[PDB]
Design an enzyme around this catalytic site. Structure first.
Site, PDB file in Angstrom:
ATOM      1  N   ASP A  27     -10.349 -22.216  23.256  1.00 29.54           N
ATOM      2  CA  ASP A  27     -10.416 -21.419  21.778  1.00 29.54           C
ATOM      3  C   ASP A  27      -8.611 -21.391  21.989  1.00 29.54           C
ATOM      4  O   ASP A  27      -7.874 -21.829  23.446  1.00 29.54           O
ATOM      5  CB  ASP A  27     -10.794 -20.189  22.046  1.00 29.54           C
ATOM      6  CG  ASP A  27     -11.360 -19.945  19.695  1.00 29.54           C
ATOM      7  OD1 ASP A  27      -9.946 -20.570  19.286  1.00 29.54           O
ATOM      8  OD2 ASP A  27     -11.692 -19.555  19.449  1.00 29.54           O
TER       9      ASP A  27
HETATM   10  O1  LIG Z   1      -7.871 -22.742  14.058  1.00 31.42           O
HETATM   11  C1  LIG Z   1      -8.098 -23.202  15.681  1.00 31.42           C
HETATM   12  C2  LIG Z   1      -8.909 -22.143  16.053  1.00 31.42           C
HETATM   13  O2  LIG Z   1      -8.148 -21.354  16.256  1.00 31.42           O
HETATM   14  C3  LIG Z   1      -9.296 -19.781  16.551  1.00 31.42           C
HETATM   15  O3  LIG Z   1      -8.803 -18.744  16.667  1.00 31.42           O
HETATM   16  C4  LIG Z   1     -10.971 -19.773  16.425  1.00 31.42           C
HETATM   17  O4  LIG Z   1     -11.585 -18.957  17.029  1.00 31.42           O
HETATM   18  C5  LIG Z   1     -11.606 -20.951  16.524  1.00 31.42           C
HETATM   19  O5  LIG Z   1     -12.473 -20.661  15.756  1.00 31.42           O
HETATM   20  C6  LIG Z   1     -10.226 -22.171  15.612  1.00 31.42           C
HETATM   21  O6  LIG Z   1     -10.985 -23.358  15.917  1.00 31.42           O
END
Ligand SMILES: OC[C@H]1O[C@@H](O)[C@H](O)[C@@H](O)[C@@H]1O
Ligand SMILES: *[C@@H]1O[C@H](CO)[C@@H](O)[C@H](O)[C@H]1NC(C)=O
Ligand SMILES: *[C@@H]1O[C@H](CO)[C@@H](O)[C@H](O)[C@H]1NC(C)=O
Length: 713
Positions: free
Chosen positions: A236
């Site tokens: 993530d």
């Molecule tokens: O935006 C890219 C990523 O950011 C993170 O903060 C989120 O938890 C993810 O779900 C997301 O895909």
């Protein structure tokens, strides 16, 4: 360990291995290392490897469509798709998303969501997923992934794993027992793998004190070895904490490469240094690249002619048909007293509530970035999983047009002012009141809600609005758009509230879909994918404020807790009203299922026998009432009582049948070995216990119409 020959992944691996042989270390480090937070044009980017015609991999959000695009559809959130209980619309939704993602020149879409699964109703991102049930979420995961990847787009199962709350998501440790981890939360990720998902994203939280992106047990042992996952694990966004342990635990891709400020670049040059200093073996990096290139080859993205990245392209085509359909068929009718719905030719209608009109939410306003507002009509929650609306059909405008077309006078109170509401409702044939609740990813605080919800009450003085309208009008229809359960006991305590419409999260087609149902062009046919309790105290989990969630409830979340603790919910999991009635008959159970541990060699999903069918449950369903409508038939299984403590009922099947009056149809539930299995912690295997399984088929988790047994020697 390795995907078998003559299967999609097997061929991708051969291809991936041939590519890897042409690469050096820098090539390899560029493939696994993101260029930096906003370092490229996409949400995620890596460095190209020209030697094998590998592009800068372009990674974009999210689970309901293309983020940042100005020519993309806003699909309904996953929870709405799940609420249709319709595998066709669910698969179609993934396909349409896939078409738009490829058309925009993105290789990897960051979705769909199997984690959070959604144990807590306050959970701020539960709406991005598919409901609280591992089986349904699993089926949805598999159908969405099949749909996305059939277009030749890489999907990303997120978030792995146990990210069940937004509060302190980057520090909290989720600490369940081994059975709970495997049997409940990992379950839907196994459907994703078995669907040949290209990528999995590891979460922000810790699992037993170890950050999810650094966790050898969950990443290597469970996901890669036990689930047989052949693709790549990405972090993530800035969920990576070390250079070396992350790599050696089985991490494959550093996203986005740095933190928001441009710091914490743990791979790139630092990964080059770790390999050169013998801290990470070359074989480990070779493995990361094989996985990543195999996903590329699997989805056919190596072939010439993949569209170039451009999120200004109008890629919508006629994809709105899916959004319309799911927004429509995902509405759950909860109460319809005196059959006030469907509406027919009333002289007048009041429409009341700020959620009825276009506001800053629908407008993509600069006040509402990442959809971080509940202002005007509501289509989805906030955060990385939100997108821009290409248009938005407000309930008022749609209702006004349909009503005006039959000489019905419409009166509008477009605020949440209780006094203006009663005034608009006074003297009218019916009053439709619009309430909401919202939530989202835990970096935006919206009206005092930090991500998770503070409580289960309607936002914007919603309860008071309904009470004021009820004080002025005998015939009130309450329409709710919400990210999750709201306690409706105050609204239901008003004898004037004759109908309650749980409209969920409709995205851009809000108004059209609601009019479809309200006027009875189609009967509502959606059913709940979470429990609406009579009391907030009836739920057994909460947003935890400390460093640890012990997950002490174990297997017993949502309806499993309600059944186990003998608590009567207001509206149970799997509940939904219709404009007609359905009669169930003729339950049969055909089974060849044998007891014991699974015995197949591990393939994507687990031992190869786990997803194979061992039994079939069948019922007939007739429409016995006066109008056409679709029914959602559900199968719940009760394991032998000799088997390790299991919830009393577990959803193991669902079928959806449209029936005209007097029409009859067959509901078929195919049962996979795993659908009769529990996870045995000591042997680290799925086991089918011997004994008599209880077979319950009905209209909800409580509305059981017929029962039988499934016996395993
Ligand atoms: O935006 C890219 C990523 O950011 C993170 O903060 C989120 O938890 C993810 O779900 C997301 O895909
Ligand atoms: C940590 O995880 C293991 C295996 O999943 C589990 O059995 C154990 O109870 C957990 N330990 C703690 C202290 O929560
Ligand atoms: C991106 O797409 C838009 C709309 O189709 C088009 O006008 C523009 O030429 C494209 N931009 C680039 C850089 O190709």
């Amino acid at each position: 360990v390795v995907p078998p020959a003559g299967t999609p992944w097997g061929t991708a691996y051969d291809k991936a291995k041939a590519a890897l042989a042409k690469l050096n270390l820098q090539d390899k480090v560029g493939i696994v290392s993101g260029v930096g937070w906003n370092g490229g044009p996409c949400v995620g980017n890596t460095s190209p490897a020209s030697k094998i015609s590998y592009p800068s991999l372009c990674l974009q959000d999210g689970p309901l469509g293309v983020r940042y695009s100005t020519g993309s559809t806003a699909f309904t959130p996953g929870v709405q798709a799940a609420s249709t209980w319709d595998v066709n619309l669910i698969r179609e939704r993934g396909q349409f998303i896939g078409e738009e993602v490829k058309a925009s020149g993105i290789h990897v879409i960051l979705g769909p969501v199997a984690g959070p699964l959604g144990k807590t109703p306050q959970g701020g991102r539960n709406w991005e997923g598919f409901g609280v049930d591992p089986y349904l979420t699993g089926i949805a995961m598999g159908q969405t992934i099949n749909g996305i990847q059939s277009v030749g787009v890489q999907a990303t199962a997120k978030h792995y794993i146990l990210n069940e709350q937004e509060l302190n998501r980057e520090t909290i440790s989720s600490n369940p027992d081994d059975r709970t981890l495997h049997e409940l939360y990992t379950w839907p990720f196994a459907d994703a793998v078995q669907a040949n998902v290209a990528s999995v994203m590891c979460s922000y939280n810790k699992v037993n004190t170890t950050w999810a992106c650094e966790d050898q047990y969950t990443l290597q042992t469970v996901l890669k070895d036990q689930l047989g996952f052949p693709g790549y694990v990405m972090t993530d966004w800035n969920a990576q904490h070390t250079t070396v342990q992350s790599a050696n635990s089985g991490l494959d891709m550093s996203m986005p490469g740095t933190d928001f400020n441009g710091n914490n670049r743990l791979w790139g040059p630092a990964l080059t240094n770790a390999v050169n200093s013998n801290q990470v073996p070359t074989s480990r990096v070779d493995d990361m690249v094989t996985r990543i290139l195999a996903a590329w080859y699997l989805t056919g993205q190596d072939q010439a002619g993949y569209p170039s990245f451009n999120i200004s392209r109008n890629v919508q085509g006629n994809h709105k048909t899916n959004v319309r359909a799911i927004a429509r068929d995902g509405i759950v009718l909860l109460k319809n007293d005196a059959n006030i719905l469907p509406l027919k030719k009333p002289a007048s209608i009041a429409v009341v509530g700020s959620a009825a009109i276009i506001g800053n939410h629908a407008r993509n306003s600069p006040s509402c970035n990442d959809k971080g507002c509940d202002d005007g009509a509501l289509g989805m929650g906030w955060g990385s999983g939100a997108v821009n609306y290409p248009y938005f059909v407000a309930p008022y405008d749609a209702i006004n047009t349909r009503a005006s077309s039959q000489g019905t006078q419409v009166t509008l109170s477009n605020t949440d002012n209780t006094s203006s509401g009663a005034s608009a409702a006074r003297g009218k044939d019916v009053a439709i009141v619009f309430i909401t609740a919202d939530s989202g990813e835990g970096y935006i605080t919206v009206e005092g809600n930090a991500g998770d919800r503070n409580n289960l009450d309607p936002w914007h003085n919603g309860n008071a609005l309904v009470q004021a309208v009820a004080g002025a009008n005998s015939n009130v229809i309450v329409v709710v758009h919400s990210v999750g359960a709201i306690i409706l006991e105050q609204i239901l305590a008003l004898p004037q509230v004759k109908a309650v419409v749980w409209a969920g999260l409709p995205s851009q087609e809000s108004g059209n879909a609601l009019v479809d149902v309200l006027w009875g062009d189609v009967s509502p046919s959606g059913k709940l994918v979470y429990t609406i309790a009579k009391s907030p105290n009836d739920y057994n989990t909460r947003i935890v404020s400390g460093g640890s969630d012990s997950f002490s409830e174990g297997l017993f979340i949502d309806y499993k807790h309600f059944d186990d603790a003998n608590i009567t919910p207001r509206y149970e999991f799997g509940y939904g009203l219709s404009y007609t009635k359905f009669n169930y008959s003729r339950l049969s159970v055909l089974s060849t299922a044998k007891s014991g541990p699974a015995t197949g060699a591990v393939v994507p999903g687990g031992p190869s026998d786990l997803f194979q069918n061992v039994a079939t449950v069948t019922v007939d369903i007739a429409n016995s009432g006066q109008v056409t409508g679709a029914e959602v038939a559900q199968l719940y299984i009760t394991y032998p009582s000799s088997a390790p403590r299991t919830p009393p009922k577990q959803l193991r099947g669902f079928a959806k049948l449209n029936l005209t009056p007097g029409q009859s149809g067959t509901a078929t539930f195919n049962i996979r070995r795993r659908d009769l299995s529990y996870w045995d912690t000591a042997s680290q295997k799925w086991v089918v216990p011997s004994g008599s399984f209880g077979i319950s088929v009905g209209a909800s988790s409580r509305d059981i119409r017929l029962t039988s047994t499934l016996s395993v020697a």
